[model samples]
Target chain A: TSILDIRQGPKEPFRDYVDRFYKTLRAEQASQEVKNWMTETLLVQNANPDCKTILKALGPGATLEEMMTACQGVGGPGHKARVLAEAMSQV
Target chain B: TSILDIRQGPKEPFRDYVDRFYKTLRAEQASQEVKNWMTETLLVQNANPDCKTILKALGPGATLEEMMTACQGVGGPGHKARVLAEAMSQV
Candidate 1:
């Protein structure tokens, strides 16, 4: 996937990103809550960049509602990414 | 990904297979129960033939302990499939 792309994408650095990502997990102490809320079935079919993006936006104790909402924003860009890829492929 | 292997030496027919798979879901009535028990964290890391295999053995409302046990047997066959596949590749 172009997700591994090393092109001109200097938005988020490793330190900031990992810090945010693990905090969500660390909150699961936050997994007690993380354990409960993190499970969503819809995620089964389409786990991709959208998956990574969605996981990044939410916090540790994020509830199902929080996750569900975050998931919505993801499909937007995921489609855009694919659309961009298809356009380039045809060229 | 050869999990979709059509060469599936014909162990179970479609009717029987779908019935069993749906029964697991039906038990969730069983997703109420299915909803509860079907969510496992470790599955996130390695979900594949091992995944399809584990889901086959368990019943709805089958507890975490039950799922965990079924999962253990699966890594056995999963490895065997890969091992066999690799050996053939080298030959």
Candidate 2:
């Protein structure tokens, strides 16, 4: 049974987290548009869902380090472990 | 019309493309410093106005074949497609 306060953080953390993430995203010419779209479009679309997902996934008793170690290299389809790490570094 | 905005790839292709891309990325295990960072941080950041728009428009072009023929081993993002066919091999 999971019982942690995954939804513990404020919208500010997520917003700030995503903004910093986009800074790295915006630096590159090739992906700059992507950062913009994600910043402008998807961020809001996924915000609540992301927050909920993070909470559910993190459950209870999960710390940032634990979360990082758990998700360290598991980036998903197009993303590699290194990419995942890079994303996490923004946080 | 401004040339259809021309994106047309598939989430399917992106996924498979991404899957194959990951295989190449995973196989290398370079810690993502230069090329790795470029691929990771660079791709999404600059996928361009076609970023999401193109996806909605072109949505994967023809197939692994058409898209492959179109981009033809782009070296980084679509690295799986072809990658300079005759050039990189020479390197």
Candidate 3:
């Protein structure tokens, strides 16, 4: 019960996943460092592959909540694809 | 990317975790069955130990949102302890 192990199931819904992530961590008295670490870990691991790069770009100190805000547009398929297209067009 | 592996890390905050859970699952084209299955899995696995009993009582077909609603009153420490005391007092 004291061990942290936030996992992101493949094919899970974003809303539901977020809900569970918080539920699991609700009871712990964690340090800010641990929280930030877990936040980045979760975001990077479960991130939309297209958004993975963007997630990493958030750098250290980005909380999970902040990642959520940054990831909003990129997480969707249309937006991801559009970003990809834009990148390809630039090439 | 198709495999589901939702994990709940310990020592995380409730709101932050929920936000991540949803973010991870947002991209998948999941069936209702899968969604519900994952929802329960997340809630059951990561639920506050105090609320496990109450969560189990929700039974099958309980969506994450429903569980959230049902758990609202019980998830709080004060309320959960009160509920437990109420149960003992009636015995």
Query: Per-residue CA lDDT of candidate 3, range A1-91, in tens?
Result: 4323443332233455566676765666788788656655654664333345566787777766776676555435765456545544543
Model 1 Cα lDDT, one tens digit per residue, B1-91: 1111111111222233333443544443433554434434222212333334446566455664555455444325564455345444543
Candidate 1 local lDDT, residue B15:
35
TM-score of each model's B chain? 0.32, 0.29, 0.50
- Model 3: interface root-mean-square deviation in Å: 21.0
lDDT of 1 by residue, A1-91 (tens): 2211222112332223323443444443434554334333222222455445556556455554344333332222223344355556578
Arrange candidates, best TM-score first: 3, 1, 2
Q: Give the winner by lDDT: 2 or 3.
A: 3
| CA error at residue A70 for candidate 3, angstroms | 1.6
lDDT of each: 0.37, 0.37, 0.53
Candidate 2 lDDT by residue in tens digits, A6-67: 11112124544444455445554556566555444443332332243444676666554554
lDDT score, candidate 3, position B77: 28
The number of the candidate with the highest DockQ is 1
Query: Count of backbone clashes for each model?
Result: 8, 18, 26
Clashing pairs in 1: A27-A30, A28-A31, A31-A35, B27-B30, B28-B31, B30-B34, B31-B34, B31-B35
Error of 2 at A73 (Å): 3.8
Worst 10 residues of 3 chain B by lDDT: B71-80
Model 2 has fnat of 0.00
